Amino acid sequence: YSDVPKFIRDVSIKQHEWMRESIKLIASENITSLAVREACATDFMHRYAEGLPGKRLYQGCKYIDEVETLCIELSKELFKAEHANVQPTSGVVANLAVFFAETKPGDKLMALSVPDGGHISHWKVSAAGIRGLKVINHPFDPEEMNIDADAMVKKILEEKPKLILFGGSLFPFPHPVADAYEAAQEVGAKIAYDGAHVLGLIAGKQFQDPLREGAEYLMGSTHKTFFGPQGGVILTTKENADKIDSHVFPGVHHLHHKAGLAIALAEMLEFGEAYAKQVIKNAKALAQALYERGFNVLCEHKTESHQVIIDIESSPDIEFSASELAKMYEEANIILNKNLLPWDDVNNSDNPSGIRLGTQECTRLGMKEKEMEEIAEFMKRIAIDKEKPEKVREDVKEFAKEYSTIHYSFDEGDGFKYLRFY
Amino acid sequence: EYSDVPKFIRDVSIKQHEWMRESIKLIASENITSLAVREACATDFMHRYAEGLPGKRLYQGCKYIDEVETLCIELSKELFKAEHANVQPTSGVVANLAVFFAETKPGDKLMALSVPDGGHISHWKVAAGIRGLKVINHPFDPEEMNIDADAMVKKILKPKLILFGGSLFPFPHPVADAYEAAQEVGAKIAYDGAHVLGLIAGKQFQDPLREGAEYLMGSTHKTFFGPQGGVILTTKENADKIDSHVFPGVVHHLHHKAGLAIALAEMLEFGEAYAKQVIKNAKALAQALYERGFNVLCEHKDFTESHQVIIDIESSPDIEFSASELAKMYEEANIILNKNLLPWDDSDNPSGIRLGTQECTRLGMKEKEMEEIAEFMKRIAIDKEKPEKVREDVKEFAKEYSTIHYSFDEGDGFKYLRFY
Numbered sequence: 053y054s055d056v057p058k059f060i061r062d063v064s065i066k067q068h069e070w071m072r073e074s075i076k077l078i079a080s081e082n083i084t085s086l087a088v089r090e091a092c093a094t095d096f097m098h099r100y101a102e103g104l105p106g107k108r109l110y111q112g113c114k115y116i117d118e119v120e121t122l123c124i125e126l127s128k129e130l131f132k133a134e135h136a137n138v139q140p141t142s143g144v145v146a147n148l149a150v151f152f153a154e155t156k157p158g159d160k161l162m163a164l165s166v167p168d169g170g171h172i173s174h175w176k177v178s179a180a181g182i183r184g185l186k187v188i189n190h191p192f193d194p195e196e197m198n199i200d201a202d203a204m205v206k207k208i209l210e211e212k213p214k215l216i217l218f219g220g221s222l223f224p225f226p227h228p229v230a231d232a233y234e235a236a237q238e239v240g241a242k243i244a245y246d247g248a249h250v251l252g253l254i255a256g257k258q259f260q261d262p263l264r265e266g267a268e269y270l271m272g273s274t275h276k277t278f279f280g281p282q283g284g285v286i287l288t289t290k291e292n293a294d295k296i297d298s299h300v301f302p303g304v305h306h307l308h309h310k311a312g313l314a315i316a317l318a319e320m321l322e323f324g325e326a327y328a329k330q331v332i333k334n335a336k337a338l339a340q341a342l343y344e345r346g347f348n349v350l351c352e353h354k355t356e357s358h359q360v361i362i363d364i365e366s367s368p369d370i371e372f373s374a375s376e377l378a379k380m381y382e383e384a385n386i387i388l389n390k391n392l393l394p395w396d397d398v399n400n401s402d403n404p405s406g407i408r409l410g411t412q413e414c415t416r417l418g419m420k421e422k423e424m425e426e427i428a429e430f431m432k433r434i435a436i437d438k439e440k441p442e443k444v445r446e447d448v449k450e451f452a453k454e455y456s457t458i459h460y461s462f463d464e465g466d467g468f469k470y471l472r473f474y
Numbered sequence: 475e476y477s478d479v480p481k482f483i484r485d486v487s488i489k490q491h492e493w494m495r496e497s498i499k500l501i502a503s504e505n506i507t508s509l510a511v512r513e514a515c516a517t518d519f520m521h522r523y524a525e526g527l528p529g530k531r532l533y534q535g536c537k538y539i540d541e542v543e544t545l546c547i548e549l550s551k552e553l554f555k556a557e558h559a560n561v562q563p564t565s566g567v568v569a570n571l572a573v574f575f576a577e578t579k580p581g582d583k584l585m586a587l588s589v590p591d592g593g594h595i596s597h598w599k600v601a602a603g604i605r606g607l608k609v610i611n612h613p614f615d616p617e618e619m620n621i622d623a624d625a626m627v628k629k630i631l632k633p634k635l636i637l638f639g640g641s642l643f644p645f646p647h648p649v650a651d652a653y654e655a656a657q658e659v660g661a662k663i664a665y666d667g668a669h670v671l672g673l674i675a676g677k678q679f680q681d682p683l684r685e686g687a688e689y690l691m692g693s694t695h696k697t698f699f700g701p702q703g704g705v706i707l708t709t710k711e712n713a714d715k716i717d718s719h720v721f722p723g724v725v726h727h728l729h730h731k732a733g734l735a736i737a738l739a740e741m742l743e744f745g746e747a748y749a750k751q752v753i754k755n756a757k758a759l760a761q762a763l764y765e766r767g768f769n770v771l772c773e774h775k776d777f778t779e780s781h782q783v784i785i786d787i788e789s790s791p792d793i794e795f796s797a798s799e800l801a802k803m804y805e806e807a808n809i810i811l812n813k814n815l816l817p818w819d820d821s822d823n824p825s826g827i828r829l830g831t832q833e834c835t836r837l838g839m840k841e842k843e844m845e846e847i848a849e850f851m852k853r854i855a856i857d858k859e860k861p862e863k864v865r866e867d868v869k870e871f872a873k874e875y876s877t878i879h880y881s882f883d884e885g886d887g888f889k890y891l892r893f894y
């Protein structure tokens with residue numbers, strides 16, 4: 053009882069230094085700056101917003117109104133939505149909320165299959181599996197990795213869906229939210245876009261542009277590809293002002309998270325274009341250099357995103373499985389995932405066909421083309437060649453430790469720094 | 475100008491504490507977090523993801539985490555003495571929702587405490603209107619505030635579920651009365667312990683899981699000093715049931731739960747010492763309250779068995795106002811209170827109010843300090859002393875001792891830490 057909190061402290065600092073020494077390439081992982089990380093630990097855990105500023109029923113919320121209004125207006129500026137609500141406590145809550153507002157049973161929810169680039173929300177035992185029920189797979193073709201809009205518009209056409217979503221876990225190139233609009237608007241099927249995975253790239257005016265391309269809704273997690281802490285955010289048309297704001301609370305919040313959200317949101321406001329551009333630029337040539345070192349990286353005719361896709365099974369000179377690489381990588385101080393590919397036979401697996409990576413956190417750490425071209429080395433060494441994994445850890449742990457800094461922010465601190473409250 | 479924003483809220487943050495450490499905070503849905511708990515919130519865990527239990531991730535790099543999740547789980551076992559627990563839920567409404575999704579179908583009857591009946595939202599629709607629907611209300615007794623047990627059992631006789639707990643929660647709900655009545659109609663029982671459970675961790679209020687509850691869900695905000703999130707304590711039969719029921723269900727916040735590890739850790743040790751004195755001081759609050767001549771709910775029953783004192787602000791000796799009116803009056807008197815709509819409320823503006831002693835209690839203040847709080851409220855409610863000059867006599871109190879007890883290391887609970 054007594055000594056365990058300092059033991060959690062132990063695995064905490066161990067965590068910190070591990071993350072400093074290791075480089076982290078993960079699709080869903082982004083780093084928080086010091087302003088927002090400090091701000092998340094403040095007393096804003098104390099109170100609650102209980103709905104919107106000016107609508108409270110609880111007292112002492114006065115400052116919370118200011119910060120919430122500030123980030124609402126900030127995102128209203130950034131993503132250029134005519135409405136925004138920052139209340140969702142996570143991305144999945146944002147999903148559940150925009151569903152609960154924009155859908156009921158009455159069938160189709162159109163989204164990617166899980167190995168096909170889906171994420172676990174829309175399908176059952178999750179968001180809209182809890183709400184919408186009624187799910188259908190998106191016409192994803194594995195060769196050029198993206199949705200084929202023809203079959204999509206067809207399914208939307210004769211088979212008459214009431215709602216359609218875009219975005220996902222596997223997201224190499226912008227999904228056709230533009231071409232789907234005709235049939236979607238025809239049947240009375242709304243268009244929503246989960247921005248989470250790409251949420252930063254769109255703020256930096258790269259990749260896709262959902263709202264100008266006809267999307268009525270855009271929502272997602274602020275902790276991935278965007279500098280914010282853990283939580284969700286919703287952005288939409290201004291006729292939904294009284295709708296989605298109602299369907300959150302009782303759809304839900306965590307106020308410290310919203311504050312850090314605001315700070316990181318302004319970091320994204322000022323430094324976002326440079327950041328995002330640098331991110332995709334940190335992606336593409338990483339994929340190329342990785343394709344030089346003998347891997348098989350998919351979309352060889354292209355990625356416009358921050359995430360990269362590798363198929364290990366078909367990749368020769370390796371002849372390993374995905375997790376087979378993933379583990380040794382994890383103890384090599386280069387950490388990625390275990391991820392399915394649309395080619396995968398069936399899904400019950402500890403060992404898929406390949407791996408999916410991302411450049412975002414390293415970019416916030418400052419890494420550029422040279423450094424990721426040097427990431428290609430550490431990556432390649434274990435698969436082809438296959439010299440000792442833990443041997444190159446003494447090399448790698450002394451590599452990433454050089455950048456402790458948080459870039460594309462207004463301050464340069466130590467991102468892996470641990471601060472003693474006691 | 476964006477360059478000036480991180481300076482903005484970190485001012486409003488260092489002012490935030492500054493308000494709350496000086497102000498006396500009576501809001502019952504809120505609590506103070508210890509430095510040990512608060513420290514883990516800033517850690518790199520903010521960036522991570524871990525899948526179910528124990529490790530079983532579809533990602534990697536969780537090597538240290540597969541242990542810490544298990545640490546929170548064990549700390550939720552040997553504490554509540556529960557056969558199983560899952561600390562993964564990212565919110566009280568997330569935990570609650572995962573429970574509603576666990577055993578139910580759309581259309582399945584769910585017996586729960588209604589909002590006008592004096593219970594929290596998410597028990598009734600517009601969450602709880604998401605997957606399963608048709609929620610029915612417990613028989614209530616406006617006179618003596620509680621559930622009505624006889625008519626409860628008679629009413630059960632055919633639901634799918636039974637729900638207890640609420641934001642307005644004066645008295646322990648009759649779990650045992652609805653226990654044997656639940657099983658023969660093929661229903662189950664889920665106790666929502668959000669506003670209580672930390673008290674149950676300190677062995678007070680009631681003992682739901684041993685009173686027959688097959689699910690116990692709770693928020694780590696209310697009556698739990700610690701992070702934001704939910705927690706689900708259930709039978710060992712339901713282990714992988716609820717473990718799987720969420721982690722497709724809601725996708726993990728690791729920094730917070732890393733704080734929850736500490737939270738539980740000190741919850742085992744100091745749980746009783748905190749829990750007893752919570753109510754023992756709260757009854758001093760209520761006793762002074764009535765000894766001043768106030769009109770307060772359950773005048774006979776000592777106005778609560780819980781941390782929440784409920785004053786009817788309609789038909790009160792000095793009002794001729796809204797309840798929310800006096801709420802704001804005390805608000806800028808730097809006494810932080812909360813609206814509570816009473817069962818006789820036909821609504822923002824309530825008949826009642828709800829007062830927690832939690833933030834005052836973890837600070838380690840006792841009965842006569844609660845007498846002081848009472849007197850502070852009498853400064854306004856009675857003698858019509860200006861709330862702003864009274865605020866000076868408010869500032870002397872909570873600012874005097876700002877250090878929280880009942881954890882391990884006593885620092886300033888509101889102490890601000892500059893990062894960069």
Ligand SMILES: *Cc1c(COP(=O)(O)O)cnc(C)c1O
Nearest residue numbers: 142143144171173246248273725
């Ligand atoms: C990545 C992602 C998440 C991640 O979990 P959070 O709830 O955001 O913490 C959730 N939902 C969607 C749609 C995502 O893409």
Ligand SMILES: *Cc1c(COP(=O)(O)O)cnc(C)c1O
Nearest residue numbers: 304565566567594640641666668
């Ligand atoms: C207090 C309470 C909650 C709180 O959950 P949040 O995560 O804070 O929104 C939920 N349900 C009930 C029944 C409660 O009493």
